[PDB]
């Protein structure tokens, strides 16, 4: 994977450009995916300038005669099978060229070399040819230009009418050409061996390769596209494709004309995201303006509301925020206009781009920094590209634009200034607004007649609505999902229970909220559309929001200030019409909507304040849907806005779903009801009634951005209107007619059964007279509220039958689990087979069965060390694994006791946190584990609240004792799936024995992401489900989050089968088993290894008291306090009990099907079948989804190797050929190697020897030393431990001195080059990302996220980019220069130095936990001398030399930063 | 500049040191302070950088350091330059380099115009003693060379 | 204790045969037999008088403040088979160690070669 771009600054061709691209290109292979055959590909492209003499030569060899004006040249892609489609595609080409004019000179047949394809990528080989086109007309480039492009547009458009498939345009231009396909990356001028010649010189040249997630590759999906090349994903398609077609409808601009009829539907069918972005980038380039100001536009940079930036930069980022929506998602992009060539980054900064210019008038810019081979002594300068920088090259003139000059530059066009003003803010007209005309309260009577008409309960406002109003955020809960789903309960689950929320798996990172907050904005915009291709001053008039949520007054302003626009529709329909009447509803208001908008209308108010006792309510989130796809449909919204009045929200949750179906602001008015009837009779204490509101704003706000941000998606505009959520229980057609784009795997209740409970709750509440709430039991258990799967019956017997060890009552409990009412998916489905019972003795014995369970991570933070050491020593007695999950492990207990036990743990897991990861710590286990999102909450970090953190666990995670630890949603490492990648491959390295397991949730599409994660050499994937149990975690996340894992398995298995990857990966699952015929249902989906959870914890004494998070656990379980951990009654035999009851029910299931093995089992999907629940429910749940049954073919349906994937040898393996004394004698070495970017994981199985052989701390510092000269590869050192010394001659590209354990990194330029040290960049991206110890000495600036997660290690760097320090929890790190924004976020532990020189530290630090001083100690002072000293002295700098010269007029400039938590702890005070 | 940066010797600072002389390191003549015969001498503090990749310290002043020493004679020994040779010996086509010292070639020590020769301490700058007695035995050693081979043609 | 190991993988066997002892033969990975030196061949190396300390005196087996030349000769090299028997005695005492000749430069040194 990677994307680069050359170009010559002065703006001349030269063979240099091509042969400099093609030699870039031979140089990626380490990132991309490897295959058995060694022919296969997945993608690769060039794109190049046109060499006139080249086709001008062929032209005279035809016998033509050469023009004089540019000539053109097209390459398309014919169908290959049928001699007779060629034809149709050749006469409707030439005849719509020949339709403008221009005159035509021939085709040619493109040469190619077919011997080095694969078998698949060969099997849909399209037939390549070119056509040349020349301008006899006499008109000019530019529109040569524009009839090519509406050439092309014409053809495809004509192409697709007679239905023909196969054909594509790759570019069609007199000015650039793209060759690309399916083949290797080294082999790209093997197969077009026409780059080999001496007439292709360019000016520019771009380069491309992608990683793909299947194996059926299609030649018209590969990069770069005409006028783009993009390295990423975007988040925002689903949402962006809805406001283009919202758009396309007003858009038209001069220069195209008539033919702008045939540019309507500008975003075809069956592109990805990279060519939909990239269409709209070239049609928005080709009506006038320039790459720089369309990258503005599409990709814009974050708004932040600081100084440091000058205003002329915020008027233009104001308009070009205003004007269009952003296009969200990790983006590393290299575009190229007629005219520029431009690269650039995205909000975030995910991906990672680093450029080099030469003396010779060169800029290289790429992923990596050693892809071309350059003497140092000729380099410039070196740099890197920060969140939403660019740096542009205009050929036409030949200047070189860097990020601040390129501002500037394009700042000086219109005058923004000026058209910005036309704006109005809503807070300034709520103060104009006199406060008369407040409304009065409605009746206490009435208010609970209003409830009970929608199921609210007397829970809902004493548990998830008070502490929003008291404190300002949300609630928080303690354990898993244990209520049936939406479709199979029977009390009233309203229509916002039926979507789950979506989120983002290794593909895709989520954005922590909590620090990155400044990028994240709610702003809302009334009367905004317009035509996007002009320059005026209407398009900035209109009403500006701050967000979308209004409280009731601002709602009433608002409505005043729009007067007599608006249009008010019913959203009632009547009790009495009969059994048709919502639809008839929907009909009539769906028609009076579009009635209303064509009457010059600009704004939609849909209110049901008409609520009576002859008229319900219509569900507002189906009212929306239906008015928005109906106003999308017919060509209007982009005239009007949708505002809702809704009387049931009362979450978060409500809000989310409103605002991701389309509508633009919502206010509800019953729980502000609620809240002023709540406060009148003093239960808030003193607050008055606006602090209530206030606060409860303030949660919906943090509530909703929490929400956004499981995505990845940082903007509101973007995000709503897109349906970002996932529909379980509804029909195909309802979901497919009402709702814009969403998937609905099975389906579920039409119009008719909402209906039914509609009218049923509103009879009930309207019919009979009510005194109070029901009390309601969702959260907690209660008599009159639904059923639970953990009841009080069942735990009492399976605790009884644990403890007496008696088969006959867990059979019992069995039983009673097995005979209640349908609550899962998995009860609808019934086993069935035909074969003859045989004998129970026959089947496997009890213990290879129990060596097929494990038990879950469950993180020493949460449980006490007793229970932890409990499930370990049961676990490691039968013979199966356990896991210690996150929060790292006791050292002393890596032995085995005295009487025998084995208090360790086989699977270690690394999480987000990186909280105990060392060296010793990977090297005690037979499997790791990367935790990529939780069962209970997906998309987000575990929790820690702060009492619990005492002095064991702070020292066992080397934190703070007493404060709050929540993890990062992100990894900071996987940003991708080649990131993924190379973790495996680190991991890989680190332990030459463990198996990589990856751990999922199941949702829709996690197919492909599993099938993609398995040419990533991993061998085990973990499928969680949506009922799983957790320590902390807010209520939202908990209910509205996830899928049953029936349905991700069964996808997983599918997918992995239909790829041929089935047989080499192993599959397991966990979340809601609790007897056998759960066991046995999940081996016939497809899992073959099964955890079990919860469950344990009910055998050891648990009650569900589901008080985790507070500390104070009856039993003690998970408490941390001592006088409760005095009340532990656990015991191992306890848990093997358990185990071994449920193999025997398996044994006896087994046995009475007719089977004799787990293995002929696994994967016979044909013994399911489904039954209905009865002829009263109706509910048309099909789970045949689920039930298909892909044929294997010759491999089996499961794991058959042995042992782990390997890897290839890196450097390590010649290291270890050389320094053999020192593991034979232990004496010191001393060795020198080249190094080069395709090496990675340099000195990673040397650390595992190291470990291994003396101990993380057994030898010296600098026992053994490398050198090494050049540009290191990814992950230098990653892993190293004491007496390591490594010291790089050059630069290192990422990752450099990850889980650093004590070793010592030295990076430093070299001797011969002509570089400030403090001025050019020397390392990546994600520096010391959770090391634990050591020294690190840098001699240029670091990259981006610098020491992140850093808990003891000390490191001294010339410079840093934005977001440094994240979230430090230990050690020094000394910065010589300036820094980025939002420096020091989240930071708990540790100090830092700055050399600050322009006096701006006050403008980009976060100062939200961190106080900055200066340096009044000389117990302080002396420390940074001595750090400065020892930099000097390793890598003999020269600007730390002048620093230290000049010692006493410098150290008044360093500005010390301090922990707000540290401030009473610190031994010497820091203070006077 | 700094003490152990002297161009002359290192003796010769101890032995003044002995008699009764006070130094003052790193320091930079600014004015002189007087009506008609000057009285003082107004004087500023520089601050030396760190030697280059070349081998040269560079020079700043610093803003606040400013003093004024007490004077009553003050003796300018900054240095000295070559004289303008080719206007005044009526030869002006002398080959003559930027600072003024004349060039000649390595072996015979001849200036451009034959039979003229030119060595000692006008072609180096400021030399000492034996470099001087070094250049004028190499220039006799080339003058006769030169005669021989005219004289006999 | 550093890691710093002061042993040499090298010893040779010269004409005096001041220190050869049968422990001094086994810490070594490779002998050699010193015919000639390449500043003076065909002659023993000297030592003063002066220049034999006590330490040496000891090391050498030898009387402290004593000029030591060592004989041209080897007293055990007369002839090839005496050197193929040596060589023979070295690869015996130490079995994994090799055995090299060192020679000087001069005419016929190509016979002489190929006879070692
Ligand atoms: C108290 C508690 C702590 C947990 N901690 C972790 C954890 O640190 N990492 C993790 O991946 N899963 C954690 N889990 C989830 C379990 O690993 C597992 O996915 C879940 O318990 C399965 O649910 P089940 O027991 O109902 O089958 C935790 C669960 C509980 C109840
Ligand atoms: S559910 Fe949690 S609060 Fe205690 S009783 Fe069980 S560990």
């Known amino acids: ?1472 | 500049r700094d003490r152990k940066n002297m161009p002359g010797s290192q003796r010769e600072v101890a032995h003044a040191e002995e008699e009764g002389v006070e130094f003052i390191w790193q320091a930079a003549p600014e004015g002189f302070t007087g009506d008609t015969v000057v009285t003082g001498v107004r004087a500023v503090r520089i601050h030396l950088g760190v030697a280059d990749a070349t081998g040269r310290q560079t020079p700043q002043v610093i803003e606040g350091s400013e003093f004024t020493v007490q004077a009553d004679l003050v003796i300018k020994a900054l240095g000295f330059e070559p004289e303008d040779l080719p206007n005044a010996f009526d030869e002006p086509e002398l080959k003559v380099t930027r600072w003024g010292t004349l060039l000649v070639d390595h072996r015979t020590k001849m200036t451009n115009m034959d039979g003229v020769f030119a060595a000692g301490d006008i072609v180096r700058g400021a030399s000492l003693v034996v470099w001087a007695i070094r250049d004028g035995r190499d220039a006799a050693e080339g003058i006769h060379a030169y005669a021989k081979a005219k004289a006999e043609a």
């Open chain 1, 1 to 1472: 994977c990677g994307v680069g771009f050359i170009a010559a600054i002065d703006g001349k061709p030269r063979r240099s450009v091509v042969e400099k691209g093609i030699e870039a290109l031979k140089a990626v292979w380490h990132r991309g995916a490897v295959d058995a055959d060694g022919k296969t590909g997945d993608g690769a492209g060039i794109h190049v300038a046109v060499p006139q003499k080249f086709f001008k030569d062929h032209v005279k060899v035809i016998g033509h005669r050469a023009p004089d004006n540019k000539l053109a040249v097209g390459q398309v892609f014919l169908p290959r099978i049928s001699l007779d489609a060629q034809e149709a595609c050749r006469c409707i080409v030439e005849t719509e060229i020949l339709a403008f004019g221009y005159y035509i000179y021939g085709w040619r047949q493109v040469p190619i070399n077919v011997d080095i394809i694969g078998e698949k990528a060969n099997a849909t080989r399209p037939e390549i040819e070119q056509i040349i086109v020349g301008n006899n007309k006499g008109v000019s480039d530019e529109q040569f230009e524009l009839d090519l492009y509406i050439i092309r547009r014409r053809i495809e458009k004509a192409v697709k009418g007679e239905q023909i498939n196969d054909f594509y345009i790759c570019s069609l231009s007199a000015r650039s050409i793209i060759y690309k396909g399916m083949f290797l990356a080294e082999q790209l001028t093997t197969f077009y061996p026409d780059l080999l010649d001496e007439r292709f010189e360019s000016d520019f040249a771009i380069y491309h390769q992608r990683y793909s997630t299947n194996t059926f590759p299609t030649w018209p999906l590969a990069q770069p596209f005409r006028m783009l090349a993009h390295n990423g994903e975007i988040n925002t398609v689903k949402g962006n494709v809805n406001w283009m077609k919202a758009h396309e409808t007003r858009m038209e601009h001069p220069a195209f004309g008539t033919h702008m009829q045939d540019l309507k539907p500008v975003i075809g069918v069956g592109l990805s995201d990279s060519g939909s972005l990239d269409t709209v980038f070239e049609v928005m380039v080709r009506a006038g303006r320039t790459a720089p100001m369309v990258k503005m536009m599409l990709v814009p940079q974050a708004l932040t509301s600081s100084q440091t930036t000058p205003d002329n930069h915020k008027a233009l980022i104001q308009y070009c925020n205003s004007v269009m929506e952003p296009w969200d998602g990790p983006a590393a992009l290299a575009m190229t206009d007629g005219r520029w060539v431009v690269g650039g980054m995205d909000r975030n900064g995910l991906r990672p781009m680093r450029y080099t210019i030469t003396t010779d008038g060169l800029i290289i810019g790429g992923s990596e920094t050693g892809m071309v081979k350059i003497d140092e002594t000729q380099v410039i300068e070196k740099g890197r590209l920060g969140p939403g920088e660019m740096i542009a090259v205009d050929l036409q003139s030949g200047k070189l634009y860097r990020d601040r000059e390129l501002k500037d530059h394009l700042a000086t066009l219109k005058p923004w200034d000026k058209w910005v003003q036309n704006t109005t803010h809503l807070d300034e007209l709520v103060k104009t607004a006199s406060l008369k005309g407040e409304p009065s309260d409605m009746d206490k009577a009435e208010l609970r007649r209003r409830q009970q008409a929608f199921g609210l309960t007397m829970e809902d406002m004493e548990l998830i609505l008070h502490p929003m109003v008291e404190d300002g955020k949300e609630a928080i809960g303690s354990m898993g999902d244990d209520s049936p789903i939406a479709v199979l309960s029977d009390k009233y689950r309203g229509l916002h229970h039926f979507f789950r929320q979506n989120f983002s798996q290794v593909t895709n990172p989520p954005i922590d909220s909590l620090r990155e907050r400044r990028v994240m904005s709610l702003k809302t915009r009334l009367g905004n559309l317009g035509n996007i291709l002009d320059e005026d001053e209407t398009q900035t008039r209109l009403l500006q929001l701050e967000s979308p949520v209004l409280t009731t007054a601002e709602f009433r302003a608002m409505r005043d200030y729009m007067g007599d626009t608006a249009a008010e529709i019913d959203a009632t329909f009547p009790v009495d019409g009969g059994p048709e009447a919502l639809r008839d509803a929907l009909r009539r208001i769906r028609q009076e909507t579009e009635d209303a908008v064509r009457g010059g209308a600009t704004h939609v108010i849909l209110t049901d304040e008409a609520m009576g006792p002859a008229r319900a309510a219509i569900p507002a989130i189906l009212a929306t849907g239906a008015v928005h796809t109906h106003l999308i449909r017919s060509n209007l919204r982009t005239f009007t806005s949708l505002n809702v009045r809704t009387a049931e929200g009362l979450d978060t949750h409500y809000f989310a779903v409103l605002i991701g179906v389309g509508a633009t602001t919502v206010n509800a008015y019953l729980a502000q009801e609620a809240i002023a009837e709540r406060h009148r009779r003093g239960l808030f204490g003193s607050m008055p009634l606006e602090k209530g509101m206030a606060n409860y704003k303030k949660a919906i706000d943090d509530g909703l951005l929490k929400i956004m941000s499981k995505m990845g998606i940082s903007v509101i505009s973007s995000y709503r209107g897109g349906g970002n959520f996932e529909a379980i229980g509804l029909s195909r057609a309802l979901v497919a007619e009402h709702f814009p784009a969403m998937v609905s795997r099975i389906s579920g209740i039409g119009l008719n059964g909402i209906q039914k409970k509609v009218l049923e709750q509103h009879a009930t509440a309207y019919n009979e007279e009510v005194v109070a709430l029901p009390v309601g039991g969702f959260y907690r258990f209660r008599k009159s509220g639904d059923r639970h799967g953990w009841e009080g019956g069942v735990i009492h017997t399976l605790q009884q039958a644990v403890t007496n060890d008696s088969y006959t009552t867990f059979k019992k409990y069995s039983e009673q689990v097995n005979k209640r009412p349908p609550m899962q998916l998995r009860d609808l489905l019934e086993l069935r087979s035909t074969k003859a019972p045989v004998p129970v003795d026959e089947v496997e014995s009890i213990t290879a069965i129990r060596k097929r369970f494990i038990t879950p991570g469950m993180s020493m933070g949460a449980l006490s060390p007793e229970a932890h050491g409990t499930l370990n020593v049961a676990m490691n007695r039968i013979g199966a694994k356990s896991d210690s999950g996150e929060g790292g492990e006791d050292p002393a207990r890596f032995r085995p006791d005295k009487n025998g036990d084995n208090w360790n743990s086989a699977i270690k897991q690394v999480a987000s946190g990186r909280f105990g990861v060392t060296a010793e710590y990977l090297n005690q286990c037979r499997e790791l584990e990367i935790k990529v999102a939780q069962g209970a909450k997906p998309g987000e970090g575990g929790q820690l609240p702060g009492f619990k953190v005492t002095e064991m666990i702070a020292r066992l995670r080397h934190s703070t004792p007493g404060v709050m630890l929540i993890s990062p949603p992100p990894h900071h490492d996987i940003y991708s799936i080649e990131d993924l990648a190379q973790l495996i491959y680190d991991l890989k390295q680190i332990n030459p024995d463990a198996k990589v397991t990856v751990k999922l949730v199941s949702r829709s599409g996690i197919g492909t992401i599993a099938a993609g994660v398995a040419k990533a050499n991993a061998d085990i994937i973990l499928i969680s489900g949506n009922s799983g149990g957790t320590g902390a975690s807010p209520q939202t996340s908990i209910k509205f989050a996830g899928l049953p894992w029936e349905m991700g398995l069964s996808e997983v298995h599918q997918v992995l089968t239909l790829n041929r990857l089935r047989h080499r990966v192993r599959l397991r699952t966990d979340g809601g088993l609790k007897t056998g015929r759960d066991i046995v249902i999940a081996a016939m989906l497809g899992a073959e290894e099964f955890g079990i959870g919860t469950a344990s914890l009910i055998a050891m004494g648990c009650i569900m008291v589901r008080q985790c998070h507070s500390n104070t656990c009856p039993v003690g379980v998970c408490v941390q306090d001592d006088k409760l951990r005095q009340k532990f009654v656990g015991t191992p035999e306890k848990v093997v009990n358990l185990f071994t009851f449920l193999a025997e029910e398996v044994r006896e299931i087994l046995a009475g099907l007719g089977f004799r093995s787990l293995n002929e089992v696994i994967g016979r999907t044909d013994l399911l079948h489904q039954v209905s629940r009865g002829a009263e429910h109706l509910d048309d749940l099909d789970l045949n989804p689920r039930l298909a049954q892909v044929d294997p073919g010759e491999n089996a349906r499961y794991c058959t190797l042995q042992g782990r994937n390997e890897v290839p040898d890196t450097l390590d393996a010649r290291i270890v050929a050389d320094a053999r004394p020192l593991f034979e004698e232990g004496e010191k070495m001393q060795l020198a190697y080249n190094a080069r970017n395709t090496q990675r994981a340099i000195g990673t199985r040397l650390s595992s020897m190291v470990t291994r052989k003396f101990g993380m701390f057994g030898l010296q510092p600098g026992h053994i030393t490398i050198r090494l000269r050049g540009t290191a590869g990814q992950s230098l050192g990653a892993f190293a431990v004491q007496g390591i010394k490594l010291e790089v001659m050059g630069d290192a590209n990422d990752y450099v001195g990850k889980g650093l354990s004590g070793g010592t990194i030295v990076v430093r330029p070299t001797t011969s080059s002509p570089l400030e040290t403090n001025k050019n960049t020397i390392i990546g991206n994600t520096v010391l990302y959770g090391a634990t110890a050591g020294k690190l000495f840098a001699a240029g600036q670091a990259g981006e996220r610098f020491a992140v997660r850093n808990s003891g290690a000390t490191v001294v760097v010339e410079g840093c980019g934005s977001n440094g320090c994240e979230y430090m929890t230990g050690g020094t790190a000394v910065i010589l220069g300036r820094v980025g924004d939002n420096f020091a976020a989240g930071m708990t532990g540790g100090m830092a130095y700055v050399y600050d020189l322009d006096d701006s530290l006050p403008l980009y630090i976060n100062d939200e936990s961190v106080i900055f001083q200066r340096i009044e100690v000389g117990h302080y002072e002396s420390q940074l001398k001595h750090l400065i000293e020892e930099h000097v002295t390793e890598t003999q700098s020269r600007f730390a030399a002048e620093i230290l010269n000049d010692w006493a007029r410098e150290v008044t400039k360093f500005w010390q930063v301090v922990p707000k938590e540290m401030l009473n702890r610190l031994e010497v005070p820091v203070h006077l």
